[PDB]
């Protein structure tokens, strides 16, 4: 430390001892604060713009599943099926006869495509078709069976009649059958337009109803998708961009505000940079050996390296979000973690402001010294953690559901060490009590074992270590 | 210290040292216990006779919804409906003829009102109505549509007969309608006098069917409501007044009591005040300098500031209840606040006739030592807190029903570090697995770190922080 | 200390040290050892006559509700009345038609009573009654109602014929009536002598089916009641008492080794008493003041104290269980809990036993040095928890079903602090959001306050107690 | 330690020191590296193929409920019975109409048995049999009953006819009859051969409806069951064994490299037992006495003890899963519980691993020191938490269905202390209040005070053995 005292020792500094050394306002420091102010609003104007299109969304699903499917009621979407011969005839049946019928059943003023697709002829609106094996005839107690893997598509085409017959002639080969599916599309008109007051948009669904056999067990699902396309609709109106100017002029900012901060914090990152020659430059090897790959890290502070993150992550949310006022994307499953993971570092940094206060700075760096000695404590379970997850896959695996998979092991093992859905698996068990006693006797030894470990001891832990970093920064 | 050894140090005084010094019997200390036993036996006489007219009230409603509403099974007053242009026909038409015929189904002896008021003309008492766009033409695929939002009310007024036709000709226009409701109103009389044994009630309901549509999604949810409009009735008995007045003069009683206990309270407030110019008075800025805005506070203590705002709250709440006997008021949600608020003021109080005892100060003055380092710690956790609510809404938003508003979203994140619905959430999340693959891992990655840091460290600093204040008190 | 060293410090003794002293081999001790291997076997052989007499019970009133109730569905035995004057007709005609032809319809062999007791008649079987008021007039709007309160029993009787008309001319009085009750009996044989191996018990039901209409509001609840009376029936068999003589001379061992250690350790308290004559009397006042009511129940030791009282539970439940061969005593709610609450305090005696060890000492004596300051903070807590029952209970109540009595408040705060319903209670709160706004803003500023002061805080002082009082043992 | 400083402390030795005294690479220690990805592989890849072929199995269980039960919906398992006489009836009858119509309703091409085996004839597929008792004539009132024990087997046959009556002649006997079963037995092909690509399984079920009626109480529960017999089916074709040579080669390195990990780990185990002989042997009784049964385990470390069994459970497992290619064995819960069991000792092995480094020894040290203080504090809980097993058990026993049996006692009683189904259990005992108003207080004594002695001080004494175990190993 020959030279450089009034340099380096600058670096190092609370911000409250600026104003005594040299003296400037806080310009750099207050840039942030407006960033709290910014990127939230941001996020609730939208927030309750996607609420507004996925309610209408859901609830026109609902309404396509009464009015087209027979004896569908609520509550019921996986539990639905067909199992004999004569209701795959009636469930099909009544599909197409409220599409031929729509316009004088249901209530809405939906209106047909006159589709030119894929899946589809020149002049058709409807089109159910058929999968199955190009070859094959198969018999138990007769063992010749013949597979060839190849799916014939036998599609029917019929169009929708609405100013004032060969799909009726329909054979499935049921004990060749794959799969039918129906493919239709519908257009309205959004009337939610009380919050808009101007032009609202105008929708197109994309309906299909699946009658899926592919376990081949007497058994088939009934379901039904939609991909709510959407586009602007050609109007004669005019002036709709009297509303539209409180909402373009608002999201550019963001582009500025968080590049603006990411002059300024990056800058702070190549100034803690140059400081590192300036150290270890006139540190001519003096104490023996100096850079041991920690002592260059000391000048890398961790909340620059997070808002630096924080200010690409919110740059790449606000471009994707531009694509609403005419661009053909639909993307909203990765413009909504570029702006929710974004928005979710922004608020941590506020904890650097409470940091530098002298009391709230012993209940933030306890975080720092136990978090290295929870973390290595973590991987002395983590171990333990996946043992028991592929012994109950595979002996409560065929006998319960919610043991089936290693998705949903891990989820069910994790929520009854902190106390929920427990009597719920303890009762499942006894329900194949009679049935195979000997998987019952090991459902007790897994689940009073699994659940006497990480509970009273391994979540007392915890507890242990927090305390015993707590007595070290005081004592 | 100079002159004020005898007062000064008689104001600071441990109340079972006041009969050493000077003497005098406790008029003063046992007048707050007599408020324990008036504002408590207060609340539960007036609890369980809002208890009976509670009861009575929720009860005819379950009974209007099973005769005026086509098909209703119980469970369902959210997924209750209509999707079909023939079912709204059918559950208007019910909901008439079920009128029209009531006192020859229904059992209670009910009684319509002929009524005078503002949704009725000179001799009606049904009386449904529609409300629809005024002018528009709306037509997808043919993009013309014109919007001029003003509500049309074309009311259609029906009279009950009792002693031994124009609202069949209804239209509705499907695609311009906004909602169409019903209003009545009926009369019964309150035959609980059992616990009475005098005059009871005599109500008048009105029951409003909501047919709303303002989704305009093919999906219009029916609905009931109730306002029970009570007053008394014109009865030609006497001698109603024999069990009256066992009830209102017991109430005059807390009037006095507390406000008698508002007189002494505050007046040991006054004469706290009048010590603090004893006091710095007579130390004339010997110490350099006395007053830094904490000395002041000395004087005034934390209990005589609780029990007269527990006597306001208290005096707000007895001139409301007095609105039972012959008043026009009908304002229950702001009479139990007064009333409920008060007497957890009143009820907390006991803690200081616990705290002057040498065994409990222990169990008690830990918890205002660790009182400020608890409610900063809560600061540290509130902006993360914060943090995980505007990263879940957005991208758990559109795909589940829990995470839909930022009053949900706080309640679900919240239920979930304290262990319940725990496995419900991580169950629902799978349900779109397949659907939008992305969205599912976030969900991963969102709801393991999200429980891991407010179980396993956060909550782990709270038991440190009580027994860090522990051991500080003994040691 | 003077006289009594080999006496005085006899008493104050480890039971291990007893051999090499005097030296008497342990029949003092292993008789309790016994009591735990005869009331536990008494206990098992007889829950497991209970259970099965309990399922044969309760699956009799299933198959009574299916036989006897219009419309019965599992699951709705709250939700199930009738709502129309109609379906009242329906339901007591359909409940008189199944008994008029119950031995053609029904699989059991059920057999009618021919009764003769208090509401039956001198050859009847049936008995539908009324209740109704004695004068009443009632009519809303014209408001001139009188109300003598005086119940008419107007019963209709009608007989059973069984080897190969006055009850439907029935008028009910809708605007007068209180509850229609039915009575009847059937009588039948267990035929589950499996396990007996001899002669079954013969029971004899009474069915009460009650239309009761308390409330006046247009609902009528149905329900179905049992009360199974349990009596011998004579046989022309012979030799029962070979199975009988397995059950009863085990039971007369409990009245006498229970006594016989009640003779034992009842004379252990009165040698504890004789030797604090012997204490005191040679102490003649030399240490200023010996007694202040805490020496003379050192020679008091709990554990004692506890047998005695068990051994009293215990003959006063053995007695009652006699009441099976042929006493016509019918109350198994006293008869099993001074067995159960007898056999907890059995059980808990083994602590003793696990006391006098060097390493399990201890585990157990800092539960009798936190045992005192748990208790004096339970205190301190249970005046802010009573404090909270009453805020909830006036001001949720009106609104919700779980904050209805402090018997249930009491239990939704409670399960609330431990983690279990509690985004269940928050999700009911959203339910009257629209509904009167400020109790839902109330609902949160309440269920946010008492959640994270029971558990943030109060919770976390009994973790500082014990460790407080463990460091207290070693250190 | 006269002789053998080299070779008695090159036995005690971390493994990182083994390159600095000697030097040899750790072909000894990287294979047990390998048994970490060549066991789990196995149990993956054999997971993966019995969740294949237990999804089709439960879902024609499903399919079968729906084709052979008469007014089956899903959900209903356990309160779908038959309570008249004229159901029975109509239940068996649908029963045995759609299995001679079974291949012209039902969907997924099965077929007969034409069976000949023990409930059979020579050519029949389908046997309805009786059970009743011999001779018996119960009459109650006129109570000669006379049992005598003994099964009559009055069986139905008839044939499925295909290609193009003495059984609606069935009589009962209601006051007399045990159970009605139904035996038949369908063939159908796995038809999920996207996975395999070769010869799929050919299966034979067999459906058990059994009609049961043991209580005699007026409730006869319907069910059904299946026993999927899996066997090869005779095949015409050719080359199946192209891709079955990925699977048999895989799983004799399994047999091989755990066994060559049995024969390096026992014989350090043979090692460890010749330097007993050379430590003691050479102390010729120098220090008066050495072996006390503590000294000759610290030979004997506790992970080759483990490593030993768990090779043994390995070996033990990979042998019956070889029972897959041709083998008539169907125990597969036997096999995956050796399987299952192994994988979990294999995992926790790991720790071991983390065992040799400075900062995850003290984690785990812990573990040690604690392990005792934890287990003997759960032997003084475990008498406590037994004496309310009995008391709840027959007290809350016949009014309760969660308290039946102490293998549903001591589920509902455990899950309650950690924080679920609490409120439930609490809401349970109130519908029970009106109903022997004892027995409701001393509920609220039962489930008050065991919640409030295993929440706030004994799961507080595992907190407290943990903190006071982990302060002594640093401190
Ligand atoms: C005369 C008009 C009517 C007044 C009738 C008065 C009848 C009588 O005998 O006087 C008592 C009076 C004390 O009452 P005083 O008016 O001062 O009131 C004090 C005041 O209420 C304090 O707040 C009380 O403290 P705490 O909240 O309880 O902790 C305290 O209660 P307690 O100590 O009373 O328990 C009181 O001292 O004496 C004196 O004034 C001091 C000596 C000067 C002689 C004054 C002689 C009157
Ligand atoms: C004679 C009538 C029948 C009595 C048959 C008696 C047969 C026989 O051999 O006498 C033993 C008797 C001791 O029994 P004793 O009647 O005093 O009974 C004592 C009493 O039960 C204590 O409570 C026991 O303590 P603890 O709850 O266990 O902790 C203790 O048990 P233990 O120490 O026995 O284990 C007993 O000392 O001796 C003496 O009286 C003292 C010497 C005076 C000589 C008396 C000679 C009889
Ligand atoms: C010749 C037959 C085939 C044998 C081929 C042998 C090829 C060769 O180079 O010999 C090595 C052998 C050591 O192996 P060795 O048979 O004694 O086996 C030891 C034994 O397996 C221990 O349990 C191991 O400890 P750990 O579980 O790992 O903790 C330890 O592993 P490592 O120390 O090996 O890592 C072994 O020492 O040397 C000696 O015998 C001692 C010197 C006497 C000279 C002996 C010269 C052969």
Redesign the interface.
């Known amino acids: 430390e020959e030279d450089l005292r009034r340099r380096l020792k600058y670096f190092f500094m609370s911000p409250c001892d600026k104003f005594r050394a040299k003296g400037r306002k806080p310009c750099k420091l207050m840039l942030q604060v407006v960033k709290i102010l910014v990127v939230?609003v941001q996020?609730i104007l939208?927030?309750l713009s996607?609420?507004l299109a996925?309610?209408?969304?859901?609830?026109?699903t609902?309404?396509?599943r009464?009015?087209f499917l027979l004896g569908y009621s609520?509550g019921?979407d996986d539990?639905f099926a067909a199992?004999?011969?004569?209701q795959?005839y009636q469930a099909i049946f009544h599909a197409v006869d409220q599409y031929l019928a729509l316009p004088?059943?249901?209530?809405?003023?939906?209106?047909y495509?006159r589709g030119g697709g894929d899946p589809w002829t020149n002049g058709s609106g409807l089109a159910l078709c058929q999968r199955y094996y190009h070859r094959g005839h198969?018999?138990?107690?007769n063992?010749?069976?013949?597979?060839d893997?190849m799916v014939v598509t036998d599609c029917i085409q019929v169009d929708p009649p609405e100013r004032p017959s060969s799909y009726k002639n329909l054979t499935l080969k049921?004990?060749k059958l794959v799969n039918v599916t129906i493919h239709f599309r519908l257009?309205?008109?959004?009337?939610?337009?009380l919050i808009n007051n101007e032009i609202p948009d105008?929708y197109?669904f994309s309906v299909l109803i699946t009658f899926d056999?592919?376990?081949?067990?007497?058994?088939?699902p009934i379901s039904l998708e939609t991909q709510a396309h959407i586009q602007e609709?050609?109007?004669?109106?005019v002036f709709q961009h009297g509303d539209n100017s409180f909402r373009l002029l608002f999201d550019v900012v963001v582009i500025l505000t968080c590049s603006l901060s990411f002059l300024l914090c990056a800058r702070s990152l190549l100034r803690g940079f140059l400081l590192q020659n300036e150290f270890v430059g006139f540190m001519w090897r003096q104490r023996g050996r100096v850079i041991s790959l920690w002592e260059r890290l000391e000048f890398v502070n961790g909340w620059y390296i997070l808002l630096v993150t924080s200010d690409v992550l919110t740059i790449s949310g606000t471009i994707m979000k531009i694509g609403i006022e005419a661009k053909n994307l639909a993307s909203?499953?990765?413009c909504?973690?570029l702006?929710?993971?974004s928005?979710?570092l922004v608020?941590?940094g506020?904890?650097r402001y409470?940091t530098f206060f002298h009391?709230?700075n012993i209940?933030?760096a306890?975080?720092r010294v136990?978090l290295?000695?929870?973390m290595?404590?973590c991987?002395?379970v983590a171990?333990?953690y996946?043992?028991?997850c592929?012994?109950?896959?595979?002996?409560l695996?065929?006998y319960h559901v919610k043991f089936?998979?290693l998705?949903?092991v891990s989820?069910?093992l994790?929520?009854?060490i902190?106390?929920?859905?427990?009597?719920?698996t303890?009762?499942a068990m006894?329900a194949q009590?009679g049935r195979?006693s000997?998987?019952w006797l090991?459902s007790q030894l897994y689940l009073?074992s699994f659940?006497s470990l990480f509970?009273?001891?391994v979540?007392?832990?915890?507890?242990?270590?927090?305390?015993?970093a707590?007595?070290t920064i005081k004592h």
């Open positions: 939230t996020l939208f927030g996607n609420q996925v309610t209408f969304r859901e609830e026109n609902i309404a396509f009464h009015l609520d019921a539990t199992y004999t011969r004569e795959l004088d059943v249901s209530l809405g003023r939906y209106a495509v198969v018999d138990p107690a063992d010749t069976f013949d597979i893997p049921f004990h257009k309205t008109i959004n009337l939610q337009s105008c197109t056999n592919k376990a081949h067990s007497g058994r088939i609709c050609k109007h004669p109106s909203y499953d990765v909504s973690i702006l929710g993971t928005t979710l608020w941590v506020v904890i409470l009391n709230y209940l933030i306890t975080l136990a290295p000695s929870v290595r404590f991987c002395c171990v333990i996946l043992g028991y592929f012994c109950g896959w595979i002996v695996g065929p089936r998979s998705s949903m989820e069910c994790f929520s009854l902190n106390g929920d859905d427990m009597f719920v303890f009762a006894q009590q195979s000997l998987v090991f009073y659940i509970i009273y001891m979540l007392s832990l915890f507890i242990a270590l927090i305390t015993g707590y007595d």
